[PDB]
Amino acid sequence: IHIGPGRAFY
Amino acid sequence: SMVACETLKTKKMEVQIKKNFPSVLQYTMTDGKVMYGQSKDVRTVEINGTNIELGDDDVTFKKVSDTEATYTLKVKDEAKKIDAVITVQITVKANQLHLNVTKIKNNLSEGIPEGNGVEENAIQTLSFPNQSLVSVRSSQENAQFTGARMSSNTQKPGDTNFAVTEDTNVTDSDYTYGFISGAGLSAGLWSNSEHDGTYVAAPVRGGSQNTRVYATTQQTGDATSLGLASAPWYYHRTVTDSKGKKYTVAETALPQMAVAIAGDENEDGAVNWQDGAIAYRDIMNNPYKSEEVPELVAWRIAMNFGSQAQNPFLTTLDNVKKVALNTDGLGQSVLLKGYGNEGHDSGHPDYGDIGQRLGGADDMNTMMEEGSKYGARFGVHVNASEMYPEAKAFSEDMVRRNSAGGLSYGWNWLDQGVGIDGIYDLASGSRVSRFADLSKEVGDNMDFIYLDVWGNLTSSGSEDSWETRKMSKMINDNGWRMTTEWGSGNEYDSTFQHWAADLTYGGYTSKGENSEVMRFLRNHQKDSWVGDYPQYGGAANAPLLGGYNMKDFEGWQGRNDYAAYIKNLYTHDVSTKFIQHFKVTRWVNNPLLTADNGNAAAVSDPNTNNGNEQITLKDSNGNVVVVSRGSNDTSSAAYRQRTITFNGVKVASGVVSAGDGSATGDESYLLPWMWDSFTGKLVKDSEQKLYHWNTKGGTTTWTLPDSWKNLSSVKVYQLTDQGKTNEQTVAVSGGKVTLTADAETPYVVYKGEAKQIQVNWSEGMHVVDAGFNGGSNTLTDNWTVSGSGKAEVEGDNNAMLRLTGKVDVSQRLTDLKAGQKYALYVGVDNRSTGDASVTVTSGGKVLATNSTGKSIAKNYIKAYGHNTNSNTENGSSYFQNMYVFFTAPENGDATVTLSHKSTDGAHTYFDDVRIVENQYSGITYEKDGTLKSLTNGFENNAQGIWPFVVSGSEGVEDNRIHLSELHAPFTRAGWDVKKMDDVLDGTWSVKVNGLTQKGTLVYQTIPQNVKFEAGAKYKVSFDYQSGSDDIYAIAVGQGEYSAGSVKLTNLKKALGETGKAEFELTGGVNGDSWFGIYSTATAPDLQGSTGNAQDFGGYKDFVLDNLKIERIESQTRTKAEAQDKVKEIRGKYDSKRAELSDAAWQQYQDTLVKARVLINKNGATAEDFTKAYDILVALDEYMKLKDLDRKLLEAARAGQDDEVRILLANGADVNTADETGFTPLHLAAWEGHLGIVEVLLKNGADVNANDERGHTPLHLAAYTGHLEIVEVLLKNGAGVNATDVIGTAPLHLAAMWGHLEIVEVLLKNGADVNIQDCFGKTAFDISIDNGNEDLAEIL
Ligand SMILES: [Mn+2]
Ligand SMILES: [Mn+2]
Ligand SMILES: [Mn+2]
Ligand SMILES: [Mn+2]
């Protein structure tokens, strides 16, 4: 699942 | 010589009666069997809770005849202010004895003073304590007591069954029904007592607790005697209203009681309550019009809400004809919820106010008169507990007040509901005069009244049986059948309970009547029982008698599935109703009754149905119905297996599909329908029919009824919305028939060829088949199709007209008043880019015309047939009403044409052609067909909030937007805590109630209502009232609404003083321009108001009136000027290609290409050059703001505190979102720019703003590890327990990394540790999975 405007997963 | 007793006698019995008191010694039947009365010298009379024992000189006696005697009782008590003379008559007929109090004389008053004033020393209550009218002894063979109390709980029976032994000890033990059996005789006691007592389960009052029988034990020699007496009666009861005003109200009826002596009435070889119950039916009260209940196969609600007119009366009549065709003419019961005022929960308590937008009293009467021909009964939803300031009945005396002297507030939705003072409403004669107002309108056409919420205590803390009886009387006096909401409510006079018939409501503890005694006696008289709903268990697990299962298809709770409605009628309702045509005679082996629930002496027989449950029912023509349970064990598959026999022949077999819609069954039936749909009399041998249903489908063999045994063949028809179809001739061999059926498909069986039910679609509607219910044939018989394209009747739910290509659909208009003004509107969903039109012509001359391009607004009306949850096409519906206004010609010749111009291939959907008398004359046109001016004061709206349409701020809802009505001073600012006016000019306005902080469109104009020409300029103005500053804004857009494509202008506060708004609009290139009302993200100023004052104050509301849209003169431009403006705009934004989004470039390119088409067309004029220039100016102003917004999102991300301030001061929107939904606040919190976060919030950035993944700026700040930003966001009012699409809170994100102090500040601010994501993980589980033992240590 994505969280930010970049390529950050969680 | 002088004897102390007399004998009253009939052909069936002799009775000894005492001369010194109205007591019976014993009843002797012709066979010699004896039943005792009162063997002891008990002469007690209770008045106003005081017992007075009478002496020999206090009673005088007179024998009138062998069947009647009269008593005069002198009841005096100086100390307790009692001095009365009571006249009592004892009558006997057949096996019945009646004891009636025929006169009550008060020697202490001159009666009730005028206006229901307080009668001092009034006889309020009266009873005969331990009168023992009928009694059983412990010394008698099978001495038993059977009682019933009210139970709405499916797990708790309302019955008690026990043996009368020496240890039996009761004193005024109160029951709704009581039966005593002993020494071969059984008897029940009937009373008209309004006493409320002991009950098993009931969630409300409203006559749920009515106990009419008192059981008492006394010693009779060495035996214990259990005697039955009436519960106390009310006579001249003194009541108090909410203001402390006292009133004396006269009796509903004089005191009455009766007994009926039975032997073995069902000839089953035993004497119990069931025998006494068969006899009891001869003496018991029968609800008014209960005789028609078996005929009401098809119950349903036709819904109207918030000025929308979703179901006008003449549309309801069409739906009645559709259901008649599909049921082969079975009886119907239609509840009109929203018949009055603006619809449902509007205009209460104005019963006489029939909704003018539905067609008023004239169309309501046509529907009722014409519908009666099809066996349809009509009734209206009324409220006697809550009122609205708009209602003419609203007054200071009508208002329910609390101890403090404030309003007793109800619910706020469209308007603020206020509790009615129920005691004042009754005692002043107010309610009875409002019902009289309705009676004057409907005459003898209406069948029932539906009383909502009575018993929930919103009118007063009482709403007892005495109150319910007076209520039921004023309704029944007007020729109306009584129906009510709650399952337990009004046991005495109700024939229907909404929470009984609709099994989905309120759970197992708040259903219909769970009593074997009550359902034995009255199953055939009411729809007030427990039906199938396995989920609830107990009584709801496959009742043998079934029970009504109510569904709807006309908007009630957004219900619109017609196929599901019909399927349901056949699954449960046809057999329930078939069973109700017979009266219960025997009921053995009930598995719900056990020794543990006080039913040790319950009726058992191991020689009947293997000791499993069986019910025997009989009619007056000696027809026997036997209903059997397969097994009495719930863990056995056979518990749900039921066999129904009609005269010893199997007519039904199997398991029904679960009433809760959870599991399909296997039940099949071939039910004989012998009755007409009127008074349910037997039809002729020719008209006799059978209904066939097979749940799973397949082939079944049946024995036909006795009258059918010698036929050689039968005629079988499949039932559809078109009537009888696919006729089959089926052979009869040995009185047996084999039937092949499709799964869940209705069939009707006749002896010979059956005629089609005659239906003339849309009677009184000036057009034939206005709703397209006539099938494919309607386009040949009623409507005329012309053109190269296709016209089709589409939709397997609510049928619509579907057009493709160049096609016209026409029909002549009938019964129009010459010279009279009419509105013609039609539902339209256009998916084609080509114009969909509606035209009214008179001999090839256009009277009025209107058209629409591609539809841009989805329908959000829950109660409407074509809302966006119904799927007109591609999972959506854009249905909206398109109007034409015309004057009917003197000529008498008028035609309606619905048409499509394109050859697009895309569809246009049309439905519900409505021609109605209407005085709206606010539209003026230019020389060319275009708009000059549109004015609207909303005084003449045929329907809805036209020229506006409801938007999706609440999704598909019973939208809190409607036309508000004037009723001064109650609707005006200043009355109570009300700070806003409901109406600004005239009688009507457009009111928005509490739709604040939605961050979306509330309502909008659409091009089919008001067309703005491309490049043309318009002045829009209106009068308004807004609760707070910037809570609502004027929205201006083009095409379908999308967040971030609308021009917004915040409206200032105008609370109690009318504001004036005016702006200019330039029509977009595609002609799809519109304006509307938008709910901003701004919080309302409640001005320190608390509780209901927050909603009634008007701080959260918006009122609009006196709308004026006028085409304005713009500064004339030359081709040169327009060409230079093209160059100017191109010079600015041609380069900016990469900067703006791909959707923004195509919007810029489109507008630029279309403006150049206007400029460079051969023979273009000054108007074309002015339009092209104005389009470019509006394009420039749009692109300028779009650039500023893009620059603001880049300055908030890069960390430029200066640029952010500059851009905000110039014009850039603080709440601008990128493609993925990130606001500048999101970007500032993520990147870590504390100053920028503070700057944006100071300006007014949304702190609870969500991106596409549901992440708020707090989620982004918690994940990254920005303590500073986390704290400043929470300070501003950020949601601490805000969850994204996976249900992840900021607490989970902080636990994921190990941001200890972020977890601390979150927990300090109120972060819930119990919050679970979609995968059931807490913040605790997420910390242990990442290897952070230090975080898990806390909790
Ligand atoms: Mn019997
Ligand atoms: Mn239709
Ligand atoms: Mn007005
Ligand atoms: Mn209203």
Author numbering:
A (entry chain E): 3 to 12
B (entry chain B): 338 to 1676
The study reports:
Here, we show how peptide and protein targets can be reproducibly crystallised as “guests” in a host crystal under predefined conditions, and we explain the advantages and current limitations of the host lattice-display method. In order to apply this approach to biological macromolecules, we engineered a host lattice comprising auxiliary- and target-binding domains; Fig. 1B outlines the design strategy. The auxiliary domain defines the robust host lattice by providing the majority of crystal contacts, and thus also the crystallisation conditions. It serves as a scaffold for rigidly positioning the target-binding domain to immobilise guest molecules at well-defined positions.
To test if a single disulfide bridge stabilises the DARPin and allows target binding, we introduced mutations Lys1655 → Cys and Ser342* → Cys (*refers to a symmetry-related molecule) between the DARPin C-cap and the N-terminus of a symmetry-related EngBF domain. To show that this strategy works for other small ligands as well, we inserted DARPin_D12 that recognises pep2, which also comprises 15 amino acids like c-pep1 but lacks the D-Pro-L-Pro unit. Again, crystals were obtained under the established conditions and the ligand was visible in the 2.4 Å resolution difference map.
